[PDB]
Design a protein around this ligand. Structure first.
Ligand SMILES: *[C@@H]1O[C@H](CO)[C@@H](O[C@@H]2O[C@H](CO)[C@@H](O[C@@H]3O[C@H](CO[C@H]4O[C@H](CO[C@H]5O[C@H](CO)[C@@H](O)[C@H](O)[C@@H]5O)[C@@H](O)[C@H](O[C@H]5O[C@H](CO)[C@@H](O)[C@H](O)[C@@H]5O)[C@@H]4O)[C@@H](O)[C@H](O[C@H]4O[C@H](CO)[C@@H](O)[C@H](O)[C@@H]4O)[C@@H]3O)[C@H](O)[C@H]2NC(C)=O)[C@H](O)[C@H]1NC(C)=O
Ligand SMILES: *[C@@H]1O[C@H](CO)[C@@H](O[C@@H]2O[C@H](CO)[C@@H](O[C@@H]3O[C@H](CO[C@H]4O[C@H](CO)[C@@H](O)[C@H](O)[C@@H]4O)[C@@H](O)[C@H](O[C@H]4O[C@H](CO)[C@@H](O)[C@H](O)[C@@H]4O[C@H]4O[C@H](CO)[C@@H](O)[C@H](O)[C@@H]4O)[C@@H]3O)[C@H](O)[C@H]2NC(C)=O)[C@H](O)[C@H]1NC(C)=O
Ligand SMILES: *[C@@H]1O[C@H](CO)[C@@H](O[C@@H]2O[C@H](CO)[C@@H](O[C@@H]3O[C@H](CO[C@H]4O[C@H](CO)[C@@H](O)[C@H](O)[C@@H]4O)[C@@H](O)[C@H](O[C@H]4O[C@H](CO)[C@@H](O)[C@H](O)[C@@H]4O)[C@@H]3O)[C@H](O)[C@H]2NC(C)=O)[C@H](O)[C@H]1NC(C)=O
Ligand SMILES: *[C@@H]1O[C@H](CO)[C@@H](O[C@@H]2O[C@H](CO)[C@@H](O[C@@H]3O[C@H](CO[C@H]4O[C@H](CO)[C@@H](O)[C@H](O)[C@@H]4O)[C@@H](O)[C@H](O[C@H]4O[C@H](CO)[C@@H](O)[C@H](O)[C@@H]4O)[C@@H]3O)[C@H](O)[C@H]2NC(C)=O)[C@H](O)[C@H]1NC(C)=O
Ligand SMILES: *[C@@H]1O[C@H](CO)[C@@H](O[C@@H]2O[C@H](CO)[C@@H](O[C@@H]3O[C@H](CO[C@H]4O[C@H](CO)[C@@H](O)[C@H](O)[C@@H]4O)[C@@H](O)[C@H](O)[C@@H]3O)[C@H](O)[C@H]2NC(C)=O)[C@H](O)[C@H]1NC(C)=O
Ligand SMILES: *[C@@H]1O[C@H](CO)[C@@H](O)[C@H](O)[C@H]1NC(C)=O
Ligand SMILES: *[C@@H]1O[C@H](CO)[C@@H](O)[C@H](O)[C@H]1NC(C)=O
Ligand SMILES: *[C@@H]1O[C@H](CO)[C@@H](O)[C@H](O)[C@H]1NC(C)=O
Ligand SMILES: *[C@@H]1O[C@H](CO)[C@@H](O)[C@H](O)[C@H]1NC(C)=O
Ligand SMILES: *[C@@H]1O[C@H](CO)[C@@H](O)[C@H](O)[C@H]1NC(C)=O
Ligand SMILES: *[C@@H]1O[C@H](CO)[C@@H](O)[C@H](O)[C@H]1NC(C)=O
Ligand SMILES: *[C@@H]1O[C@H](CO)[C@@H](O)[C@H](O)[C@H]1NC(C)=O
Ligand SMILES: *[C@@H]1O[C@H](CO)[C@@H](O)[C@H](O)[C@H]1NC(C)=O
Ligand SMILES: *[C@@H]1O[C@H](CO)[C@@H](O)[C@H](O)[C@H]1NC(C)=O
Ligand SMILES: *[C@@H]1O[C@H](CO)[C@@H](O)[C@H](O)[C@H]1NC(C)=O
Ligand SMILES: *[C@@H]1O[C@H](CO)[C@@H](O)[C@H](O)[C@H]1NC(C)=O
Lengths: 223, 52, 242, 207, 126, 105, 146, 126
């Protein structure tokens, strides 16, 4: 089974640098890139970059160019990241992710089916609606996300204190272990995720995703 | 569309970044990408006039 | 099994020329001829000519042999068996007897004895050749009236009065309200101006739950009017229900 | 036109009707092909018969064609209410184009609402009474106007009966009046006569 | 005119029926890395004998063209004679009939030459 | 009037698929010899007069990113590199300690 | 001018060299005369284009022990080549990568990439595809026997 | 009744002559260890074309059954019509005729279609 094992979180001071590791297992490390995404509470998730272990190729987000350094150890299948000149804005939980489709022939990076446990680091478009949704067990939740670019859209679920789990990809295709209660629909630029017969496990926060961009999130809580 | 039994002479030039000894494009230089909005997919550029 | 969409209706003075387009989609544009057939109120149905987009051979009627030019663009492939294309035609030396509806039609077969035969037709483009100049319409709101007291239904609408030339398109709420809409043909007054009326039958209980905006479009004068039909009626047979 | 069809032909429901399409030898019919088209006035025509006796794709087998040496014919078995329209024929070949005929009008054997002139029209100032007629058959009605129970012969105009989409007919009549006559008469009426029965709607400016 | 192998690919079925003897001719054509072509020309001749076996068990044997005693079911895309041979390509036709190819094949190998040849065995003894 | 099925053999009908491609590399390249340069050893000589038939009226969809010829060529060059390095001298006793120094400059 | 047809008409396109990684990705890796060069492509991708006489020399390193195609298990020692090696080639195309997480700003930055050698084959096999022939086609017509 | 492949093996030759289209149908059927089946199905198709060649050069071509203008030699186990088709299996018959199979084959490929077809070439020119 595909497993991403991350190093723990840490508390840094402003001006310092941080380094994180993520050991992949259960698949051929060279087949597809590993991504690094930061999630700050009540903030749009930020994709930092990807690395192809084959050749060590890298691609950094504009915001981080000159500050971030991504490398890998092919022998230990471990991906490393470093972030310099830390400021209060960098406080967030940092994840390493791997896409769902990853064979020898080709891949698709942005359907993040595999996530590390995350590392909490404290240093001291896509229009998603509604912001919040208070519903009772049994009802149906309809979350909406408006795009402007189109392309394989995904829905993720984050449970309080757990790593996000891929729920839907391609706008209408369920992932492994996802029951029929979850369903996706599309009309023009609009995307709807419908969760029927709500239950305790379903509550959390949900995100829409289009390539490296994420929505502001929708907190679904029990009422 | 035309049909052929054998393709033209393709030299297996193993190189990176700069495509060497390739086929020139027609008219304007060509830009090919599987997903332009995707910044993770490489962008193959084909020239019309070769750079010596 | 495709679709032929033509350009909008234009108004041209006698002596000038006019170019009517005909975009096709949903089939191979090069596999069928493009016939052009007009219809006036004085000469009946008349076949003008056809043109084959693949080669470019044309065959015009002797009546339109010296004043009609047919042109076709290249085929834009969509699938392996369907495509999108566009055919044009330019008729010069317009006269008063050229006023009528002009259609473009797709051929029936590729081979045989009836290859060019007009099979699939368009919606038609009305062409008016007149000196009498363009006059804008005058939209007046038609007050809702009582249609059935026991039923609690009414009928409100708009009045397009004094316009030239034809036609005038009237929609409701940008094409949202279509059920129960009855548009009556216009009347030819003694002055030569047309005037039609549109009326939609709606229940009386709908007042502050639906906005009634009649959209009158008159492209020859390049003018659009969006009138807010007041839901408050004046018919005594309907006020009892309110 | 040189291709002559039948002026008018009729037929009862559930029966047949034959439409003629003849002309000189230069257009019909030796070594010539004949086609037929269902062309509703104001709508797009539909190909029915091509190559004398062959039916167009998707055409019900109720239609049939037959060509002799001097004229061609079209038999429509089992008549439908939506078959009462104009049907044209075409004399053509493989090289030359189409030479349509004169046409054949095939005959297969009311809600009135009067609107008074709006307030915006009274500030122009004009006055036009609108008598709308809908959902009536057959298309043959007469419209008479009255100014306070007295015949009106000025400014009376009525449109031709047009077939709707629900296989029924509609029309509209208009009365052009002056702002003085609108405020000098107690009421105005719009009598519509159909098959002897005369319906009448009356509006009153006094109320 | 000789458009060549796969020449009349975009032409109608009636027009492409004239080029049958062209695509049939070039269908057979007469340490590792040398077995790469061996296993390929073996699958090539297995594909050829597969089609020849289907062509033999049916009421054809004689290649190119052959007729059969099977009524065309209207559910198999009810088109007209002049709408198939003069208004449709073979690729476009096979795209529609792909659902019923195996059904027709079953109505050709079983219902025909198994009942027809036995009938001839009954007709040839007298 | 009732139609009857007829089997046609040799119709221009193709479908997208993947098969085993073989090589071709002219006839002058084989004269380059030098103990089999690169690959050309048992490769079929290229047809002197190749034929390219333009399929009129034909519109076919291509996909360079889902094309199997790329994967086949890649694996072919990899196997080529291995077969080209199998009979060569192996430098197993070359990982000895190297007492290195600067070049004479 | 062709890049502005896909990322907006009035935009700034900036060129920067590789972000980092292995030597085969950050440098122009190629073979010439048997030797394996790795050239510095920082003088070619160092520009900034707005909406509207000599030679550029690049420092090239030489490696003899290579592990191309990211292969582990087989390391090949390129034997030395006698004589001055000179080679003239054609630059006929590029393999570029675009930087992500933009949102803000109208400029776009492109850097040299590579790694996957399949892209080198995709630059020549884009106009070819393999199809299989199915010559058996049934069709209705007014033909039978007795 | 359909006994299946090799069904009427113990039945008389007359009874087993009804199952000819069953053993003929399943006679063709459509890294090392994978070449084990390749070389076998290649010998399978070589055995098939071998029998088809013998069936073709003789006065048959049309498979299953065909008649010939060859007098039955009494030395080839002189049995009666009712003693063969109603009292002997195909295995028991082939066990006796194994000596003369090659002789009859020679009298079938040479004496017939080489002298008969040339006779037809002489009969078809007039
Ligand atoms: C190589 O160059 C070629 C050009 O030669 C090129 O091909 C064109 O590529 C361009 C992109 O640059 C295309 O233009 C885009 O088309 C996208 C796809 O359109 C399909 O999908 C539409 C949506 O379908 C879903 O939704 C409907 C309704 O809900 C649903 O019913 C279906 O089930 C489906 O689920 C679809 O409607 C559309 O169909 C219309 O369009 C075709 C013509 O394209 C037309 O013939 C049909 O009759 C029908 O009217 C089409 O099938 C597309 O998403 C996009 O539109 C979005 O973006 C624009 C803004 O950019 C938005 O305004 C718009 O609102 C949408 O959000 C745009 O139209 C074009 O389709 C390609 N041409 C062909 C033939 O494929 C390549 O892209 C180039 N390649 C590279 C690598 O550069
Ligand atoms: C893109 O495509 C271009 C076009 O081909 C290609 O350029 C080629 O570059 C290579 C170098 O990498 C060239 O191949 C070498 O060329 C040199 C110099 O050529 C001179 O000699 C010939 C002799 O007639 C003259 O005609 C010519 O004009 C020049 O004056 C040769 O010396 C090389 O020969 C040796 O090397 C080969 C490979 O190592 C051997 O196979 C060959 O047998 C030779 O080996 C013998 O001679 C050596 C001489 O010292 C000796 O030391 C050895 O031990 C051995 O005994 C070689 O042919 C080529 O010339 C270029 N092409 C052209 C048209 O000139 C690019 O390389 C290509 N890009 C990529 C990335 O591949
Ligand atoms: C590619 O796809 C196209 C369709 O887009 C094909 O072209 C059509 O082919 C059909 C026939 O299969 C055409 O129909 C014929 O038009 C001819 C036009 O004649 C003039 O032009 C030719 C060429 O310049 C001249 O030599 C001749 O002198 C004329 O000046 C007619 O003569 C035809 O009428 C005759 O043939 C029909 C049978 O088709 C008979 O029934 C008639 O009685 C008469 O004898 C016919 O109308 C059509 O013209 C073609 N298209 C174009 C644009 O010309 C291609 O066939 C297809 N590709 C391939 C490879 O087939
Ligand atoms: C790479 O590194 C290696 C060493 O690991 C080098 O190989 C050695 O190179 C040095 C040169 O710096 C060689 O030293 C020379 O040896 C010559 C051999 O002469 C022999 O015979 C004479 C009698 O005729 C004896 O006296 C002598 O001891 C030898 O046994 C000497 O003749 C040379 O002397 C000349 O040059 C010196 C330079 O200062 C002068 O002072 C002298 O007067 C005289 O002109 C010299 O001593 C050594 O032999 C090489 N060893 C091997 C094993 O090959 C490479 O040179 C080096 N390469 C680079 C690029 O750095
Ligand atoms: C065998 O050959 C291998 C080549 O495939 C060599 O592997 C590489 O060795 C270099 C060093 O020369 C490494 O680069 C360094 O990595 C360190 C990592 O520091 C962190 O890890 C160490 C060890 O756990 C720890 O002590 C530190 O505190 C850090 O936590 C960097 O700090 C350096 O700056 C430098 O980048 C490569 O990472 C390594 N790569 C691989 C794939 O192994 C190997 O060294 C050779 N064996 C020997 C004995 O030299
Ligand atoms: C990316 O490519 C896929 C495959 O053709 C396509 O479905 C998708 O729409 C593309 N995305 C964009 C944004 O064009
Ligand atoms: C013909 O098709 C129809 C509709 O699918 C079906 O009811 C019938 O069984 C079919 N008959 C044959 C003989 O295939
Ligand atoms: C033509 O199509 C119609 C409608 O499906 C059908 O009634 C008729 O049998 C077809 N005729 C031929 C000759 O295919
Ligand atoms: C093929 O059969 C499926 C399932 O019945 C259906 O969805 C599809 O429309 C059919 N297509 C054709 C071309 O008959
Ligand atoms: C890019 O060029 C800069 C010079 O400004 C150099 O310092 C850097 O190492 C280069 N990076 C790569 C990956 O070539
Ligand atoms: C490439 O060249 C730039 C500019 O001289 C330099 O800064 C950089 O260090 C060089 N890269 C390497 C790997 O030497
Ligand atoms: C890139 O170009 C600019 C402008 O000429 C120059 O200032 C800078 O030093 C260059 N970078 C390198 C690494 O040469
Ligand atoms: C490379 O470019 C040069 C310069 O024009 C040209 O002479 C040569 O033929 C080209 N090589 C090719 C196209 O293989
Ligand atoms: C028939 O058998 C006898 C004795 O075995 C033999 O002499 C004769 O040659 C045989 N006939 C033929 C045609 O071989
Ligand atoms: C029957 O068998 C006998 C004895 O072998 C033989 O004399 C006779 O010719 C045979 N008759 C037939 C008809 O086979
Ligand atoms: C087969 O031939 C041999 C040699 O003449 C003989 O001994 C044997 O009896 C023959 N068997 C049969 C069944 O004819």
């Amino acid at each position: 089974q595909v497993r991403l094992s991350q190093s723990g979180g840490q508390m840094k001071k402003p001006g310092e640098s941080m380094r994180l590791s993520c050991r992949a297992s259960g698949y051929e490390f060279l087949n597809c890139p590993i991504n690094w995404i930061r999630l700050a509470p009540g903030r749009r998730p930020e994709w930092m970059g990807w690395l192809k272990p084959r050749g060590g190729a890298v691609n950094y987000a504009r915001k981080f160019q000159g500050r971030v350094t991504m490398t890998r150890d092919v022998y230990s299948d471990t991906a490393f990241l470093e972030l310099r000149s830390l400021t209060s804005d960098d406080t967030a939980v940092y994840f390493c992710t791997r896409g769902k489709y990853c064979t020898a022939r080709d891949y698709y990076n942005w359907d993040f089916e595999h996530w590390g446990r995350g590392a909490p680091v404290t240093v001291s478009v896509l229009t998603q609606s509604p912001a919040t949704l208070s519903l009772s067990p049994g009802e149906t939740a309809i979350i909406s996300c408006r795009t402007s670019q189109s392309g394989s859209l995904a829905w993720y679920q984050q449970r309080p204190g757990q790593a996000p789990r891929l729920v839907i990809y391609s706008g209408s295709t369920r992932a492994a272990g996802i029951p029929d209660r979850f369903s996706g629909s599309r009309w023009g630029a609009d995307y709807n995720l419908s969760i029927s017969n709500l239950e305790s496990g379903d509550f959390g926060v949900y995100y829409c995703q289009q390539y490296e961009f994420f929505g502001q999130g929708t907190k679904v809580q029990v009422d | 569309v035309s049909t052929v039994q054998c393709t033209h002479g393709i030299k297996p030039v193993v190189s990176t970044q700069l495509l060497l000894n390739g086929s020139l494009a027609e008219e304007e230089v060509m830009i090919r990408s599987e997903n332009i909005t995707n910044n993770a997919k490489n962008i193959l550029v084909q020239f019309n006039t070769p750079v010596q | 099994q495709g679709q032929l969409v033509q350009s909008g209706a234009e108004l041209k003075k006698p002596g000038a020329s006019v170019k009517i387009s005909c975009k096709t989609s949903g089939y191979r544009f090069n596999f069928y001829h493009i016939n052009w057939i007009r219809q006036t109120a004085g000469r009946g149905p008349e076949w003008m000519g056809w043109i084959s987009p693949y080669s470019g051979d044309k065959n015009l009627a002797p009546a339109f042999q010296d004043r009609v030019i047919m042109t076709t663009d290249t085929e834009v492939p969509v699938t392996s068996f369907t495509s999108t294309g566009a055919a044009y035609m330019e008729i010069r030396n317009l006269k008063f007897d050229d006023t009528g509806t002009y259609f473009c039609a797709k051929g029936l077969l590729r081979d045989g004895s009836s290859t060019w035969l007009p099979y699939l037709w368009g919606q038609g483009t009305l062409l008016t050749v007149s000196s009498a100049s363009t006059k804008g319409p005058s939209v007046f709101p038609l007050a809702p009236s009582s249609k059935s007291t026991s039923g609690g239904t009414a009928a409100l609408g708009c009045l397009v009065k004094d316009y030239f030339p034809e036609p005038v398109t009237v929609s409701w709420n940008s094409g949202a309200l279509t059920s129960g809409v009855h548009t009556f043909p216009a009347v030819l007054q003694s002055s030569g101006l047309y005037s039609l009326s549109s009326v939609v039958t709606v229940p009386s209980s709908s007042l502050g739950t639906q906005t009634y905006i009649c959209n009158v479009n008159h492209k020859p004068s390049n003018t659009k009017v969006d009138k807010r039909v007041e839901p408050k009626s004046c018919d005594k047979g309907l006020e009892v229900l309110f | 036109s040189v291709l002559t069809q039948s002026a008018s032909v009729s037929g009862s429901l559930g029966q047949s009707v034959t439409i003629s399409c003849t002309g000189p030898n230069s257009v019909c019919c030796s070594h010539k092909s004949i086609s037929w088209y269902q062309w509703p006035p104001g709508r797009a025509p539909t190909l029915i018969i091509y190559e004398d006796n062959e039916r167009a794709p998707g055409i019900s087998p109720r239609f049939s064609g037959y060509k002799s040496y001097w004229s061609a014919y079209l038999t429509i078995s089992d008549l439908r209410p939506e078959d009462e329209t104009t049907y044209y024929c075409c004399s053509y070949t493989h090289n030359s184009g189409c030479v349509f005929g004169t046409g054949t009008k095939v005959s297969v054997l009311p809600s009135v609402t009067l609107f008074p002139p709006s307030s915006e029209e009274l500030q122009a100032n004009k006055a036009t009474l609108v008598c709308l007629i809908s959902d009536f058959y057959p298309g043959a009605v007469t419209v008479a106007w009255k100014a306070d129970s007295s015949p009106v012969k000025a400014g009376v105009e009525t449109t031709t009966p047009s077939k709707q989409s629900n296989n029924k007919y509609a029309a509209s009549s208009y009365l052009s009046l002056t702002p003085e006559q609108w405020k000098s008469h107690r009421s105005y009426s719009c009598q519509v006569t159909h098959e002897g029965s005369t319906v009448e709607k009356t509006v009153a400016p006094t109320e | 005119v000789f458009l060549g192998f796969l020449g009349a690919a975009g032409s109608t079925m009636g027009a492409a029926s004239m080029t049958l003897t062209v695509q049939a001719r070039n269908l057979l054509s007469g340490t590792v890395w040398g077995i790469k072509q061996l296993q390929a020309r073996v699958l090539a001749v297995e594909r050829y004998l597969r089609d020849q076996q289907l062509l033999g068990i049916w009421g054809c044997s004689g290649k190119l063209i052959c007729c059969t005693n099977v009524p065309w079911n209207s559910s198999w895309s009810n088109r007209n004679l002049s709408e198939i041979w003069d208004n449709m390509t073979w690729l476009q036709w096979d795209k529609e009939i792909s659902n019923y190819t195996q059904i027709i094949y079953g109505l050709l190998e079983e219902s025909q030459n198994q009942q027809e040849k036995n009938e001839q065995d009954l007709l040839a003894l007298d | 009037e009732n139609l009857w099925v007829t089997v046609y053999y040799g119709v221009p009908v193709w479908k997208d698929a993947e098969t085993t491609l073989f090589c071709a590399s002219d006839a002058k390249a084989y004269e380059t010899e030098k103990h089999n340069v690169w690959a050309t050893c048992a490769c079929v000589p290229t047809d002197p007069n190749p034929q390219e038939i333009h399929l009129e009226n034909v519109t076919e969809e291509f996909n360079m990113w889902k094309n199997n010829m790329v994967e086949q060529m890649h694996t072919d060059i990899i196997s080529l590199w291995d077969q080209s390095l199998k009979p060569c001298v192996k430098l197993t006793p070359l990982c000895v300690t190297l007492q290195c120094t600067n070049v004479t400059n | 001018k062709q890049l502005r047809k896909h990322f907006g008409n009035n935009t700034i396109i900036r060129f920067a060299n590789s972000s980092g990684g292995d030597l085969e990705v950050t440098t122009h890796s190629f073979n010439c005369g048997g030797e394996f060069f790795y050239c510095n492509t920082s003088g070619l991708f160092n520009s900034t284009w707005i909406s509207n006489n000599d030679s550029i020399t690049l420092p090239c390193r030489i490696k003899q022990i290579i592990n191309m195609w990211q292969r582990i298990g087989q390391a090949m020692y390129a034997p030395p080549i006698q004589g001055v090696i000179r080679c003239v080639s054609n630059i006929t195309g590029l393999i570029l990568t675009r930087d992500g997480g933009a949102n803000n700003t109208s400029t776009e930055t492109f850097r040299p990439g590579g790694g996957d050698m399949r892209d080198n084959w995709r630059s020549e096999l884009y106009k070819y595809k393999v199809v299989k022939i199915e010559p058996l086609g049934v069709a209705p017509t007014r033909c039978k026997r007795r």
